[PDB]
Design a protein around this ligand. Structure first.
Ligand SMILES: [Zn+2]
Lengths: 99, 78, 204, 60, 154, 128
RNA sequence: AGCAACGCGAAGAACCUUACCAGGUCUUGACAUCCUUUGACCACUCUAGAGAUAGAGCUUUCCCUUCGGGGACAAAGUGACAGGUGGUGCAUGGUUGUCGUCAGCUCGUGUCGUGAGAUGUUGGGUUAAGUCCCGCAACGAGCGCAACCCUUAUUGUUAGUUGCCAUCAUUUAGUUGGGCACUCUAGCGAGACUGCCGGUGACAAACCGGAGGAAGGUGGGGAUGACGUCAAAUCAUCAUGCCCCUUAUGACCUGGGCUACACACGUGCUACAAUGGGAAGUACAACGAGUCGCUAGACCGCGAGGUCAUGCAAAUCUCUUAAAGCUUCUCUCAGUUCGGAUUGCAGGCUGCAACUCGCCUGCAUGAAGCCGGAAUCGCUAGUAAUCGCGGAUCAGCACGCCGCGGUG
């Protein structure tokens, strides 16, 4: 509703931590923030041969999960915009605010 | 399947246009085995490099849609 | 070849990535920039005994932190060397960089430090049997549940290669909640290359 | 010859279908992943050490 | 195996006739896991049985089974470098196993234009002491009760 | 009205079943169970809980099913119908319990391993 | 290069890749540092050439100034030097295969032995297990085994959008009003322990049976591979000791092999039909991928495809109405309405360009093959057998590889 967040990360611990940060500092100055809704956690898969020259019949498999989290804000106020676009922690987590 | 106009090379077509006037020479020596045999190549004698040498091929009329590489093989069996 | 890398078996379980940034559609460039960075700063490391390096990055700045055992001999007199580190790293990354230097405590309980030090004796014509023994002796006195070392190659600067190491205390490898450390270095005396490996168990 | 070929790989190609990928640490031309720009067995080497962010060993 | 005997693989009695024997017969006709085809085949065959000179498909099927199943099978064994064959008894599950197996095998080789025209016809010929299935049983009984010679003290 | 709801799972298929007094009938995904699963006789697998306990009518059954194949999402329907019947009267948890009809079948598709043709089938071998 | 080489390095040979061959070319050099003159280098256009290159045209042009310097760079000089997929896996590091996920390998204090050494770690039972019990000059301990990690089988709670629609109106419809009940998604917790009940057995460990429960005896599957063996494999991923080349074993370009064919061996796909072939109708999944990419829809073409155009950086849109299945109508046991090799003609798509040497379409042709000797292989349950779908690599190119689910 005319303001909403999106957060991607590789660790759900950091993800939930920052989601609680934003939810708390949002409902401190406003009201009615839709919960941190979870999204379905994309996954990839990489198979590789673990030997430099021969032996195709023995491999090692890797992956990279990407956790997702959604937060929608209802009825912002000329102070929520301020108190939201300023908090920034932590480092390796993607934030994308679309109106 | 180049239904957007068949394919010659500029050097090859330049040479053939240049000799189009009079009776022709056997010295048209090009590598160019990708080119097709336009209906103006008749009567000449093209030299087609086969990876080792320059084979001459005399262009009759029945050979008018094929390529210049179809008349100079490369493998040498028996 | 029948053992897994002990700090790749445990990454994403009890330890973290030494590179913590999230990016998409700018991922190859970032990974090779980190590689360039880390392959460069092995310049001062040649003397200052650095162990790890942690790369984070923001909108256009790059936050770096390095763990060393020589704080003054890496920052300068009054701050005249970190200046150079930043003004040199800007020439590569073309961004703003901010080194935040950490200092390491108990440096004898670190795999890269120990192994790299006991792989510098081999170059100075020292016998290997007592290098490893004194290494594990000065690693146990700092207080450690177990340690294991191993050297390989043409020993004594001699003919056909062999291998041998020494163990002290327990070093359980199959336990996933173990917090072990590991590193692999190289050196030469005059013949070929040697490989030194070191594992230290520091509780969980 | 593997120092002239890395040079010849980085100059602009003579035709569209003449460019090809190589590894960036080494110059291996076979089996490179084009999300990382790393070959078959630098991937397995930098996945350990936890340098590539994301990637880890998979089991299910 | 080596450790010791194993279980018996419980079966699920089919719901039409509520008879585990029809279940095993469906399982033996089926090839490649296409079970609905096998079920259609068995049901068309039983329809053909009852419609033409029949009383009930279970009755004539049981009697055909009774007339085909064997009671004396032999086993060719090795001792120390010379091999022979000796008769032995036959436990119950093996009996119905062999019965079903022979009936299906020798209906599959009939030579008409439908598996039903083969199966119904063959188990009718079987419930009247006829058909290569009964002859296979009697070949077995004749091999036994003769090769008891080099079996009398085995 | 009164109604009874249960949830049934089998082999990548999940069903949401509703019991409602009536005259004995079942419709699934706005179609008739004679047409939705018209295979041969899987319906006689579905109507088994009514056959063993609460014998035997009369409830109209309305179900919402999605996932798996035609034979998985009928064992799932059976699972759900049984759970719903349990909900009606708890005294049924013995007759149903005796005849299976109350447990989830945890027989899923085994995963493929590398170096093998399938989950367990290996390549062809030659001693020489 | 037996098991442990032979759909293996190669997860993509038309040019490139490319190391090989034939012709055309260069020598401080395709790539790096230094020192000096110094210093801002270009790109673009036109003739000759198969190109590599050479010859001419607007010009590579101070971005720090205290008048005094430093960054990028072409040429030259200038030689230190570079360069090698050249040799040695029997000089090496590192990284793998196999015995084999088999159950083993050692120490401290005692005791025994003149001594090297032994005991423990032997014996009975049991166990998947050097896993446990009983006995015993032994008593304890370490790495191995098992546990801690992942996924699947049941559920409580927190959160309802892009997911869902049970109680309501509405339309083509979950769509729009409404709701978060149900399914689902994903964080945090519960639950399985021989934990109770009966028998066997040295009362012991353990085994057999029952109750309850979604699940019962390491519930199912993965990751995890000890001390060691084969001078096993790899100087061609990368490094590196010694040896070798240096106007050539280095380097640039076009065209040709790597795809050649009297044959022999391995791994696969399609069939030899009626449990089938053909025509019409009706259904049911899961894992994954997408920005110069995935293409909705409408139209043109018998078809592969083409044109105009639409949504989506994604639980929102698309790839994607799965195929076996079910229901009708045929065909009648035949080298055939089975089979689809080979050849003729005409097209499409990517690409500067499909002759050697690509994939696909249509019409025409219609081979061997009627279940395969000696011998030999895979597999113990959602497994074998059978059926499709996705993606890494990649302009294009898969019967191979990695995963997913359906019937069973
Ligand atoms: Zn690489």
């Amino acid at each position: 509703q005319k303001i909403r967040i999106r957060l991607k990360a590789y660790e759900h611990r950091i993800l939930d931590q920052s989601a609680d940060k934003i939810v708390e500092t949002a409902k401190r100055t406003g009201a009615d923030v839709s919960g941190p809704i979870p999204l379905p956690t994309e996954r990839s898969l990489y198979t590789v041969i673990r030997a430099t020259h021969k032996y195709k019949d023995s491999r090692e498999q890797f992956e990279m999960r990407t956790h997702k989290r959604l937060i929608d804000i209802v009825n912002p106020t000329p102070k929520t915009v301020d108190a939201l676009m300023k908090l920034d922690l932590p480092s390796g987590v993607n934030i994308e605010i679309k109106l | 399947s180049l239904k957007k106009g068949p394919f010659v090379d500029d050097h090859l077509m330049k040479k053939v246009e240049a000799q189009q006037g009079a009776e022709k020479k056997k010295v048209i020596k090009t590598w160019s085995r990708r080119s097709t045999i336009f209906p103006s190549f008749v009567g000449f004698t093209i030299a087609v490099y086969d990876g080792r040498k320059h084979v001459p091929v005399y262009i009759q009329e029945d050979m008018v849609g094929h390529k210049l590489g179809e008349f100079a093989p490369t493998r040498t069996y028996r | 070849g029948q053992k897994v890398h002990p700090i790749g078996m445990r990454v994403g379980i009890i330890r973290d990535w030494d590179a913590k940034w999230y990016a998409e559609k700018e991922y190859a460039e970032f990974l090779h920039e980190d590689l360039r960075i880390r392959k460069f700063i092995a310049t001062k490391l040649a003397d200052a005994a650095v162990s790890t390096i942690e790369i984070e990055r923001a909108a256009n700045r790059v936050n770096i932190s390095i763990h060393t055992a020589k704080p003054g001999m890496v920052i300068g007199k009054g701050g005249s060397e970190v200046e150079n580190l930043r003004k040199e790293l800007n020439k590569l990354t073309g961004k703003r960089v901010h080194i935040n230097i950490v200092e390491i405590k108990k440096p004898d309980l670190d795999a890269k430090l120990v192994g790299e030090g006991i792989a510098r004796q081999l170059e100075n014509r020292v016998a290997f049997r007592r290098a490893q023994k004194q290494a594990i002796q000065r690693a146990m006195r700092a207080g450690a549940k177990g340690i294991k070392t191993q050297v390989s190659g043409r020993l004594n600067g001699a003919d056909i290669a062999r291998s041998e190491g020494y163990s002290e205390g327990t070093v359980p490898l199959h336990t996933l909640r173990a917090d072990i450390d590991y590193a692999w270095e190289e050196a030469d005396t005059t013949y070929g290359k040697l490989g030194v490996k070191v594992w230290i168990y520091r509780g969980e | 010859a593997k120092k002239s070929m890395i040079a010849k790989n980085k100059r602009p190609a003579k035709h569209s279908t003449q460019a090809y990928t190589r590894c960036e640490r080494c110059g291996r031309p076979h089996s490179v992943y084009r999300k990382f720009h790393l070959c078959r067995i630098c991937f397995r080497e930098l996945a350990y050490k936890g340098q590539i962010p994301g990637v880890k060993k998979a089991s299910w | 195996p080596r450790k010791g005997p194993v279980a018996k693989r419980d079966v699920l009695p089919d719901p039409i006739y509520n008879s585990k024997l029809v279940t095993r017969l469906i399982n033996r006709v089926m090839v490649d896991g296409k079970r609905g085809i096998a079920a259609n085949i068995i049901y068309n065959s039983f329809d053909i049985i009852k419609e033409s000179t029949g009383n009930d498909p279970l009755e004539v099927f049981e009697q055909a089974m009774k007339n085909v199943m064997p009671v004396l099978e032999v086993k060719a064994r090795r001792v120390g470098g010379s091999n022979y064959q000796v008769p032995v008894e036959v436990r119950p599950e093996r009996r119905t196993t062999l019965g079903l197996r022979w009936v299906v095998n020798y209906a599959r080789l009939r030579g008409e234009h439908t598996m039903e025209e083969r199966l119904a016809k063959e188990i009718m010929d079987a419930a009247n002491n006829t058909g290569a299935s009964v002859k296979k049983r009697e070949d077995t009984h004749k091999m036994a009760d003769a090769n008891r010679a080099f079996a009398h003290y085995r | 009205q009164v109604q009874y709801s249960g949830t049934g799972r089998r082999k990548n298929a999940v069903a949401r079943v509703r019991l409602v007094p009536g005259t004995g009938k079942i419709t699934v995904n706005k179609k008739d169970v004679e047409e939705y699963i018209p295979h041969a006789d899987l319906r006689e697998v579905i109507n088994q809980p009514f056959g063993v306990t609460e014998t035997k009518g009369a409830y109209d059954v309305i179900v919402n099913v999605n996932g798996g194949g035609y034979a998985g999402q009928s064992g799932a329907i059976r699972h759900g119908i049984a759970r719903a019947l349990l909900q009606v009267d708890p005294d049924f948890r013995s007759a149903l319990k005796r005849a299976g009809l109350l447990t989830r079948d945890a027989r899923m598709v085994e995963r493929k391993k590398p170096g093998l043709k399938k989950a367990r089938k290996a390549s062809q071998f030659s001693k020489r």
